[PDB]
Structure 1
Amino acid sequence: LKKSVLAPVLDNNPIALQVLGVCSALAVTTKLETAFVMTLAVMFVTALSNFFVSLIRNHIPNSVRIIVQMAIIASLVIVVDQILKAYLYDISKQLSVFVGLIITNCIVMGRAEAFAMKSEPIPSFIDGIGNGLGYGFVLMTVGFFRELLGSGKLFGLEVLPLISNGGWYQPNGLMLLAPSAFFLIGFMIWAIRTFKPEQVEAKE
């Protein structure tokens, strides 16, 4: 049901409402290529890990649940990285420095704990896909501004000609540093909670 897969895009965003994917959002958002690849990888890994954890949720002792979940997640990530290196070397070259960051992306384990341990396999798979889409929404939106303003490019295609190449645009150097990502995500949250005001935090 699309209502299940599209909720985490705006209603329950893993970053704008939950705080679960911040590090990679700050790291991999200087190019739309890397942002897109990371979105796909996280979506795939979260879906599969949710499915597998939910398959055996009734046999996991509470004292080793973290170990079980992390073993499944790490195995999936390692196999994915090996396959990419074997068959998609060009793509693997981009994601190589961030391979480890996928294992500790809080989204995967947070959704395994919150949903997969309570729900059934197919619902858990759909939940993983939806959270991946919500994560990718923020990643792509931030990467758009960062890449365009820091280099005048989108997916590596020249859009704003640079002065160094006889153009008119002078790139912004702060768009290649983390503070720009912090500010962009803050203003994105501001807009998201200006619309849909039910998410506004209380007090004051």
Structure 2
Amino acid sequence: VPWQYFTSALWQYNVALVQMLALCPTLAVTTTATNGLGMGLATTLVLVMTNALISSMRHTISPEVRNPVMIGVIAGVVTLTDMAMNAWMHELYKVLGLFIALIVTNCAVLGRAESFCLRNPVIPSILDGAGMGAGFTAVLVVIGGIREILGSGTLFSQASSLLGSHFKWMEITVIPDFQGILLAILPPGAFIVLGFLLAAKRVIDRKRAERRQ
């Protein structure tokens, strides 16, 4: 079934939890959960588009010039994405900054472009790209929620200004009247949260294996 690639792409192989890839935007833009949601959505869209293009052009690639071709067919596409978000999603564009343009070297994306889409049809490539984009989005949302709850108290914030006013129902405040721990927003607060998340993932993997046995 094509749908099992999508289901395998969330948890059994995750880009930031299993294969240890795309850690730059994982630890860089995660101070707010809406920022992680927007970056994950943009990464998912770019991954789906470039996976479709690479799998469409799969029987045209020279073997020893294989890198600067696909990098090229990544790069302009990402530039088009940048030239979307500088025109209509400019509020999200100022928040991410460099890393929305820095998707052409998001390893997970190039690792997916080289390993998967060079030998499989268009539909499995699109499904696997969407699945690993969704897994990256879920990881970013979880880490952003943990860090922003620790650092300011509130869950998903400035959703109207960033992701549109229609998402205003996502604003929820937990721990009211809280100044917040300033270290969690800072760069040392991201590595520790990712390490604890990896340890928790290993713990529930062992517990699920023990439940199945």
TM over 0.5: yes
Is residue 125 from structure 1 mapped to residue 126 from structure 2 by the alignment? yes
Matched, 1:4 2:5: yes
The aligned counterpart of 2:135 is: 134
The residue aligned with 1:45 is 46
Q: 2:17 matched to 1:16?
A: yes
Q: In the alignment, which of 182, 202, 206 is matched to residue 173 of structure 1?
A: 182
141-150 vs 172-181, which moves further = 172-181
- Residues 82-124 of structure 1, C-alpha deviations (whole Å, 9 max, x = no match): 1222223333332333222222111110100110111111110
Q: Aligned-pair distance for 1:13? A: 1.1
The amino acid across from 1:21 in the alignment is A
Please tell me whether residue 99 in structure 1 is matched to residue 114 in structure 2: no
Q: How does 1:30-179 map to 2 (within 5 A)?
A: 30-156=31-157, 157=171, 158-161=173-176, 167=177, 169-179=178-188
Residue-by-residue CA offset, 1:160-182 (whole Å, 9 max, x unaligned): 33xxxxx3x23111101222211
Asked whether the 8 Å contact 2:34–2:141 carries over to 1, the reply is: no
In structure 2, the partner of 1:164 is: none
Unaligned runs of 5+ in 1: 162-166
Which piece of structure 1 moves more, 188-197 or 58-67? 188-197
Q: Distance in 2 between matches of 1:197 and 1:8?
A: 20
User: Structure 1: how far apart are the matches of 2:22 and 2:130?
Assistant: 15
Following superposition, the deviation at residue 15 of structure 1 comes to 1.3
State the percentage of identical aligned residues: 36
TM-score of the two chains, using structure 1 as the length reference:
0.88
Pair 170,84 (structure 1): closer, same or farther in 2 beyond 3 Å = closer
CA contact (8 A) 2:43 2:133 kept: yes
Q: RMSD over aligned Cα, in angstroms?
A: 1.8
1:180 & 1:8 partners in 2: Cα distance?
A: 27
Give me the whole-angstrom Cα distance separating, in 1, the residues matched to 2:94 and 2:17.
30
Amino acid at match of 1:137: A
Whole-Å separation in 1 of the counterparts to 2:119 and 2:4: 19
Provide TM-score, normalisation by structure 2: 0.84
Structure 1: 4+ residue segments shifted above 6 A: none
Does structure 1 conserve the Cα–Cα contact (< 8 Å) formed by 2:40 and 2:140?
yes
Q: Distance in 2 between matches of 1:172 and 1:185?
A: 17
Aligned length: 193
Q: Which has the higher helix share?
A: 1
Task: Find the aligned partners of 1:90 and 1:174 in 2 and give their Cα distance.
Answer: 25
Contact 2:39–2:100 (CA under 8 A) maintained in structure 1: no
C-alpha displacement of 1:159:
3.1
Which residue identity does 1:160 align to in structure 2? I
Inter-partner Cα distance in structure 1 for 2:206 and 2:120: 29
2:160 alignment partner in structure 1: none
C-alpha separation in 2, matches of 1:129 and 1:177? 30
Q: Are 1:196 and 2:205 counterparts?
A: yes
- Structure 2 distance, partners of 1:94, 1:182, is 21
